[PDB]
Amino acid sequence: LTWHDVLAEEKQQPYFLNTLQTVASERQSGVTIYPPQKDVFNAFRFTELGDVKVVILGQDPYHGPGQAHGLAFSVRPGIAIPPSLLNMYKELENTIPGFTRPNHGYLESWARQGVLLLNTVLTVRAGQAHSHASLGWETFTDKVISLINQHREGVVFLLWGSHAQKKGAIIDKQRHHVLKAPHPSPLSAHRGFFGCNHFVLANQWLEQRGETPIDWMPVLPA
């Protein structure tokens, strides 16, 4: 089963086609939009439906130049590690043996292992956070989640923050494994994120089902 097969009908909806249209019209009139158009759907390219093992939900892309590249939380090589990702690394340093702070924030190796890094809103206008909200993306990603719920079994969902947790109501908690915690953001990290053990719990779930664990140590492609 591929994304192509399940999303076939959705790509035909007027609303979805008009979301793409609005973005295209904005790019043409001189508005800078992130990520680049070719990267907008990278999460789907690197992690195929049948390969999904873990889903980590994000909000919208980074709005600074050279940051976002189509994956939630990840930034290109050479870009400073953002606060939330830095906190995620810290959680990894004191919960996983042999893990050491990577020195870059590029997470393609996670996606390649079955970790779907999905943002709920797929585009953003430069320097304007949450500027592409309520345009159609949420409706589309709601459907993506609903499809994983329906066509897969035993997937782990890491829902951080209240906004992401609400989106986790569509998920069948018996067929799938849902884990919740405060957002990794510095404002809330000390109220539950640090010590949530999500990365360990995630691997334990996979191990008991007879699946390979995730090597959370990010690697720069050579």
Binding site: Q59, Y62, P82, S84, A129, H130, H163, P186
Partner: protein, 82 residues
Amino acid sequence: NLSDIIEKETGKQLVIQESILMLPEEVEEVIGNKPESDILVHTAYDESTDENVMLLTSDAPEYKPWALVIQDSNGENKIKML
């Protein structure tokens, strides 16, 4: 501009690296005060002092300033209502 408010408030011109959306109750559990609507947590990092500078504003398209929070390496923070 958002980065201007930060400079105007900290005297240091910092770069906003991320903006996270939070619901009123989430914020309340930390600030001890409930905002009237959803807020965005715009975060910048000060390498010289090793501290996170967070500017909280309402959602788009207004971006109305609500509070400024400075957090040190110990996790302790100083809050300022704007």
